Design a protein around this nucleic acid. Structure first.
Ligand SMILES: [Mg+2]
Ligand SMILES: [Mg+2]
Ligand SMILES: [Mg+2]
Ligand SMILES: [Mg+2]
Ligand SMILES: [Mg+2]
Ligand SMILES: [Mg+2]
Ligand SMILES: [Mg+2]
Ligand SMILES: [Mg+2]
Ligand SMILES: [Mg+2]
Ligand SMILES: [Mg+2]
Ligand SMILES: [Mg+2]
Ligand SMILES: [Mg+2]
Ligand SMILES: [Mg+2]
Ligand SMILES: [Mg+2]
Ligand SMILES: [Mg+2]
Ligand SMILES: [Mg+2]
Ligand SMILES: [Zn+2]
Lengths: 155, 99, 60, 207, 127, 83, 116
RNA sequence: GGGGACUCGUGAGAGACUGCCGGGGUCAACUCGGAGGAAGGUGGGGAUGACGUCAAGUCAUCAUGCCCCUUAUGUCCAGGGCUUCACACAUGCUACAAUGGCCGGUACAAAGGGCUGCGAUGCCGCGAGGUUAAGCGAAUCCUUAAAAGCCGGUCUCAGUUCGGAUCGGGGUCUGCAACUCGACCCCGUGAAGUCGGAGUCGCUAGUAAUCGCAGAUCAGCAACGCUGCGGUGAAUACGUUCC
């Protein structure tokens, strides 16, 4: 707002996995207040995954998130008679949240029966670099690289 | 024993306490016994009224009612204090029951 | 409201389902309570005047 | 208007309810006749200058306290009008009544009387611009007045367009809850209509 | 004189009755796992305990009432946080740095008139 | 009154205007203002005059409509169309 | 597998598969499968011919089916039309018969929007 | 039975006041950060609407200056109307599903209401409901089982085991009376609706969202409206270029 940034909300360690990204991805998945439901979904995704991964599931999900992490986005601005976009660097806490928000949004429209294994194959194909959010990464990246010419308007 | 039970009731504070603690005390000087005043949870009745006489829904006023309940439960029964209990100048806003 | 109407409301109409309640002070046919027998405006100003006991404002 | 009643505010904080009783089931028909008794005592008695009316009611014995400016008219020739209003109250309530017309210890700092004085003088059709000033002077001669605001609204002398103006002095904190502020409002009756006279009188924080 | 601690989160009331023992958490005469099925709840059931590393002893007991699942979980966590310091006068700064003895005051605020909920407002419809 | 324990509801101001005519076997019409009486199988072939709100409409209870109410057969509001 | 003329699609379970019948719902299926002894959890592709005999008589002797409900419903709405009742007139004119609001509604009894 | 341990109830109070320490600032107002503290800088919310503006609204709460009727604009009663219907706008509820449908089992509340009443249990009816009747003017008894939630099974992407408008038939309750025009229940019937253009709205935390519960008015109720109570419960805010 006007008076500086607002304080962020801490998120405690997951009981199943000594990691925070699970606790935060489940909260992203959360809708209407079904923490229990979203949590069993995330856990079921990882526990379905370990069979086809062999690697530890949070290690696999980190591999996916390192792929789908944005670096430089295309934030808009209008100066004269024509609006255009500005390539701007994305700080990591925004970048990871945006990446896994894309994951949730495109796992809500992927083609299987239900979202448990939908998200499961999303995680594995993002750790292997083939997915829909994966291709969004390098299309948003190239859209911003094609507007790097306007990076000299950094507000 | 549990032969006499009163249910002093009123609308507000500093009336029930005065009517109980210092006016039912007039019996213990005769050798009786009370267990002290007993507070009872207070109800809260709520209304909501349109402020304007016409056309304004989004402006209201709230009016409420508190009725405070107390019990005493004097125990020791004595024949010469029944009349004493009957002859008590209760304050105007306090009502008394006998059980 | 109208004086004939307040008289009708105060009377004993046939077919008791027909009986209704008006304001105790102005005869308003709407927004009248039962524990108060008194409409909304003529309850507001009466309670502000404090002429009916046990009433105040609130804040929770 | 946009000002709430200071009485409505400080009811239970600074000031007290005019009527004190208890009821659960027959409160409605106590209020029914309470409004009637206020109509009765406010109808035909305006000369006495009513200040306020207390009602007490306890197990079929009622006590009607009345504070007015002049206890003289209502009593009359040693009980020629007090018993008259007692009888017209008996035939109304069906209940033995302890009527007690006491006093107002000073009828010039007590609002709900300043308003009626100003209103009667307006009905007498002399300048409200002298009325409000003399109310100010009469209200600054008591040992305990830290402020008074007088406000009159209406046609105010046959003007085709109404107007509402106020005078004040001292401090009258209507937004302060610890402020003893007594409010009065009376409807002056005149040849061209009705004039609102509202007075706030501040008598210290609290005692 | 055995201890008696009271814990609450938003309405839930728990009455913790710490006893030195072997570890047996029968809240309201019922087991942790079957009472609260949420791993989210039974991390914080023992989080104040694992903070001081005294899990394997001092079995507790509490009467549950009011609110919901997260309310009862927070109530019990507050109860244990204010329970350990009565039998040990040395873990107070550690528990305070952990920030578990805080009551966590967060109440649902009232609905206000002119709105569809506490803050949710009716549709504007400028014209 | 729509409950199958208290029977139907038929106006007593109508019952003894229809029975005294059924007994002497006449088909005179009774000019009535009762939209609420439930027609029972005692007005078969009989002609009523119902008050819809402005005038009267005749109704001829032939053989089957007897299972409805008198006020159902009385159009009151007058609408034809906006054009 | 034509049961009575509704031709149940295969790969379906009894308790809902019977509900496609015009006149037999889920609560009805709870008794068509109760008085015949046919379990709720089954595949209709595994339906025995002897069992289809066991319900080829119970339905026709204790229930009522396609045709002899449609005929009845058109018959009595036709009766309301012919008797000149309020409901019959309303049904002819196509706006709601149960006293529904006819000012910003009645779209279900009428058609799509007209926008005169 | 018993006990003042605890809760809770509700009375009196204490505590939060830049109070103390570190830094900056004329040593000021103040400001950043810490110790203690449940709460830290106004702890959160509410009540609170300065002078006035809109000849803003209300002559239909009430009062009222002038104008107007008196076999009528007064007044009583039965009906019908204020609920209509080619359209248009406004505010809402249900949906268009698998973060779900259904079956079964199984937990965790808050606030209110009750004598013209709450109807515990038992029995009858599939159910709305019906009957006997205990207790309760209520921290006692009823309302009351809260619902979303968890476990297991079925359903398997379909205009469906979605949706529940719509219609026929049969009913309960209230009310003298249910057609105009009440609510609730059962069976079968099973529309539009597959996420809504231009445009536009609300929301910064126990919030949005979502889920029930309660009340006023009220015999009954179109209660999806209004005011309240609580369960679960979020994501974002770099910042002021733009609106
Ligand atoms: Mg202020
Ligand atoms: Mg508006
Ligand atoms: Mg105007
Ligand atoms: Mg106007
Ligand atoms: Mg007039
Ligand atoms: Mg009439
Ligand atoms: Mg209307
Ligand atoms: Mg279940
Ligand atoms: Mg049964
Ligand atoms: Mg399931
Ligand atoms: Mg359905
Ligand atoms: Mg369709
Ligand atoms: Mg679809
Ligand atoms: Mg009601
Ligand atoms: Mg009524
Ligand atoms: Mg809520
Ligand atoms: Zn009134």
């Amino acid at each position: 707002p006007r008076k500086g940034p607002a304080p962020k909300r801490p998120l405690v360690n997951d009981p199943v996995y000594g990691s925070q990204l699970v606790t935060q991805l489940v909260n992203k998945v959360l809708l209407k207040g079904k923490k229990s439901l979203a949590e069993r979904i995330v856990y079921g995704a990882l526990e379905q995954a370990r069979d086809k991964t062999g690697t530890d599931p949070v290690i696999t999900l980190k591999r996916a998130l390192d792929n789908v992490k944005p670096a430089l986005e295309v934030r808009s601005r209008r100066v004269g008679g024509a609006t255009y976009q500005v390539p701007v660097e994305v700080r990591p806490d925004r970048s990871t949240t945006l990446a896994l928000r894309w994951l949730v949004g495109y796992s809500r429209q992927r083609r299987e029966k239900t979202m448990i294994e939908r998200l499961a194959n999303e995680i594995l194909d993002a750790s292997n670099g083939l997915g829909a959010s994966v291709k969004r990464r390098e299309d948003t990246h190239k859209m911003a690289e094609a507007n790097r010419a306007f990076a000299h308007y950094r507000w | 024993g549990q032969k006499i039970r009163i249910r002093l009731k009123a609308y507000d504070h500093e009336a029930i306490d005065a009517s109980a603690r210092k006016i039912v005390e007039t019996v213990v000087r005769t050798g009786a016994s009370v267990v002290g005043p007993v507070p009872l949870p207070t109800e809260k009745n709520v209304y909501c009224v349109i402020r304007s006489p016409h056309k304004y829904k989004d402006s209201r006023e709230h009016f409420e009612m508190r009725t405070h309940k107390r019990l005493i439960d004097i125990i020791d029964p004595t024949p010469k204090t029944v009349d004493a209990l009957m002859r008590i100048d209760l304050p105007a806003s306090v009502d008394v029951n006998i059980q | 409201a109208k004086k004939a109407l307040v008289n009708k409301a105060a009377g004993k109409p046939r077919f008791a389902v027909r009986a209704y309640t008006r304001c105790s002070k102005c005869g308003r046919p709407r927004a009248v309570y039962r524990k108060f027998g008194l409409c909304r405006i003529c309850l507001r100003e009466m309670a502000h005047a404090g002429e009916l006991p046990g009433v105040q404002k609130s804040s929770w | 208007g946009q000002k709430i009643n200071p009485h409505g505010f400080r009811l239970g904080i600074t000031t007290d309810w005019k009527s004190r009783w208890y009821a659960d089931k027959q409160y409605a028909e106590y209020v029914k006749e309470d409004v009637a008794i206020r109509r009765l005592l406010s109808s035909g008695l305006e000369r006495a200058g009513i200040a306020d009316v207390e009602i007490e009611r306890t197990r079929d014995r009622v006590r009607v306290d009345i504070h007015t400016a002049r206890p003289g008219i209502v009593i009359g020739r040693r009980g020629t009008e007090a018993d008259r209003i007692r009888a017209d109250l008996e035939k109304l309530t069906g209940k033995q009544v302890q009527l007690n017309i006491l006093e107002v210890k000073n009828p010039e700092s007590q609002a709900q009387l300043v308003a009626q004085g100003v209103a009667e003088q307006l009905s007498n059709r002399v300048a409200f611009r002298r009325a409000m000033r003399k109310a100010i002077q009469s209200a600054m001669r008591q040992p305990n007045v830290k402020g008074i605001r007088v406000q009159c609204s209406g046609r105010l002398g046959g003007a085709e367009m109404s107007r509402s103006e106020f005078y004040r002095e001292g401090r009258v904190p209507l937004h302060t809850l610890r402020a003893d502020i007594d409010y009065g409002l009376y409807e002056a009756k005149t040849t061209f209509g009705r004039i609102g006279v509202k007075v706030w009188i501040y008598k210290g924080d609290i005692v | 004189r055995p201890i008696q601690t009271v814990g609450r989160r938003k309405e839930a009331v728990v009455r913790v009755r710490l006893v030195p023992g072997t570890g047996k958490f029968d809240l309201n005469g019922r087991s942790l796992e079957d009472y609260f099925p949420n791993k989210v709840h039974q991390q914080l059931i023992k989080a104040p305990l694992v903070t001081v590393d005294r899990v394997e002893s001092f079995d507790i007991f509490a009467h549950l009432g009011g609110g919901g699942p997260s309310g009862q979980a927070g109530a019990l966590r507050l109860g244990i946080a204010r329970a350990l310091i009565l039998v040990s006068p040395e873990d107070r700064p550690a528990l305070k740095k952990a920030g578990f003895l805080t009551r966590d005051p967060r109440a649902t605020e009232r609905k206000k008139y002119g709105l569809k909920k506490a803050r949710k407002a009716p549709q504007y419809s400028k014209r | 009154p729509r409950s199958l324990k208290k029977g139907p509801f038929v106006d007593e101001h109508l019952l003894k205007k229809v029975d005294v005519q059924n007994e002497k076997n006449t088909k005179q019409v009774i000019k009535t203002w009762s939209r609420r009486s439930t027609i029972i199988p005692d007005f078969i072939g009989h002609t009523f005059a119902v008050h819809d709100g402005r005038k009267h409409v005749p109704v001829f209870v032939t053989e089957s409509m007897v299972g409805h109410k008198l006020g159902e057969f009385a159009p009151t509001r007058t609408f034809k169309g906006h054009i | 597998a034509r049961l009575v003329g509704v031709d149940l699609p295969r790969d379906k379970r009894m308790e809902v598969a019977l509900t496609y019948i015009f006149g037999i719902g889920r609560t009805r299926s709870n008794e068509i499968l109760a008085a015949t002894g046919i379990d709720r959890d089954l595949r209709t592709r595994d339906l025995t011919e002897e069992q289809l005999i066991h319900l080829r008589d119970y339905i026709e002797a204790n229930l009522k089916v396609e045709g002899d409900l449609r005929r009845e419903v058109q018959a009595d709405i036709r009766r309301k039309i012919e008797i000149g009742c309020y409901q019959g007139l309303r049904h002819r004119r196509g706006m709601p018969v149960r006293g529904q609001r006819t000012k910003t509604n009645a779209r279900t009894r009428k058609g799509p929007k007209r926008t005169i």
